[PDB]
Amino acid sequence: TVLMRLVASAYSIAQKAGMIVRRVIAEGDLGIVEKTCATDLQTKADRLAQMSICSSLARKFPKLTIIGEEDLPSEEVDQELIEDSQWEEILKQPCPSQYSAIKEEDLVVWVDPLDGTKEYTEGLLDNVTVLIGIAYEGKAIAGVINQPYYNYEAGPDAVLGRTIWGVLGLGAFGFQLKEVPAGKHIITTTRSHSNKLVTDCVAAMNPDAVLRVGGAGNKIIQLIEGKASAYVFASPGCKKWDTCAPEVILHAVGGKLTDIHGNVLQYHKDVKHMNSAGVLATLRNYDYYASRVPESIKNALVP
Ligand SMILES: Nc1ncnc2c1ncn2[C@@H]1O[C@H](COP(=O)(O)O)[C@@H](O)[C@H]1O
Ligand SMILES: [Mg+2]
Ligand SMILES: [Mg+2]
Ligand SMILES: [Mg+2]
């Protein structure tokens, strides 16, 4: 099927993006550009990874809609950046029948070529993900997440980097699902984009621990691996490419991702990019957290 060949291609493409991300650091010049402010950055890895991802997808799927974070002038793309492979192991998995007839022109791909760029520049390398989300009829249905510096500090016997993928109806793959210890409320949130509304919303959850880490992809991986019980970000700032692939993986293991009002996010081609009402995500016990978002904070954000 189109969908599963897409997913298999996105897996190999994400890995190539992860290689580019690691090569940029290995070579030592990040080419940092400030966009709106000093915490809103774009590096040579953001730009090269996006060129790689988008070019490689468009070559294979010429009528697909592809939407990437970075606003890059249209240039020659370096042909070494093209990834032609697709991981045959994913094509061994049966496409769910509900998706088996989808045409490429009806799919929307939401790409964050490097998520956690501020942290990447600061050396918090394992916060970084590459996000490729696939949506149909406004719903996020499949996703690939590369974590190019997974195991960066695990020592010399460990595999560096990993790729996680999922398709709703088949589940999600590439990690060990774990829950936080019972009765413990561990809230994860932004490290670099905090404000009073964000920290007040965190405080309202009566946290046992608050983690401050970069990346939307990274924080969803914290939920699925039992490092945090809730991701709580009561602020605009993140966009559909930050949430599309991560929500697929979270949904695939029974979790929930919504705005702070409890609305599901939408992923149609023409949807506004901003997640203007923030993000609330959990693996389990969603209602504990949702029921504690203060009304003042809800009223401070809209769609
Ligand atoms: N105020 C902001 N400005 C720019 N990007 C943001 C902002 N808030 C969140 N993001 C993005 O949303 C994702 C998750 O945010 P964080 O938890 O701060 O890493 C990352 O891409 C951030 O760069
Ligand atoms: Mg950004
Ligand atoms: Mg990014
Ligand atoms: Mg991002």
CATH number of 278's domain:
3.40.190.80
Q: Which atom of ligand 1 is nearest to the CA of 40?
A: 4
Instruction: Indicate if ligand 1 lies below 6 Å from the C-beta of 40.
Output: yes
Residue where one domain finishes, among candidates 154, 174, 194:
174
CATH classification of the domain holding 159: 3.30.540.10
Q: Which of 40, 187, 193, 231 has most ligand 1 atoms within 8 Å of CB, for mutation?
A: 193
Indicate if 84 and 153 belong to the same structural domain.
yes
Q: Are strands 107-115 and 65-68 parallel, antiparallel or unpaired?
A: parallel
Q: Which domain holds residue 146?
A: 1-174
Long-range contacts of 289-295 (CB under 8 A, 24+ apart): 289/205, 289/229, 289/230, 289/232, 290/258, 290/262, 292/204, 292/205, 292/206, 293/201, 293/204, 293/234, 293/260, 293/261, 294/200, 294/201, 294/204
8 Å CB contact between 134 and 268: no
Tell me how far the alpha carbon of residue 288 lies from the centroid of ligand 2, in angstroms: 30
Indicate if 38 and 170 belong to the same structural domain.
yes
List of E strands, 30-167: 33-37, 40-42, 65-68, 107-115, 129-136, 139-147, 162-167
Indicate if 163 and 296 belong to the same structural domain.
no
Instruction: Indicate if ligand 1 lies below 6 Å from the C-beta of 115.
Output: yes
Indicate if 60 and 191 belong to the same structural domain.
no
Catalytic residues: 46, 117
CB-proximal residues (5 Å) to ion ligand 4: 112, 115, 242
Q: Is 219 annotated as a binding residue?
A: yes
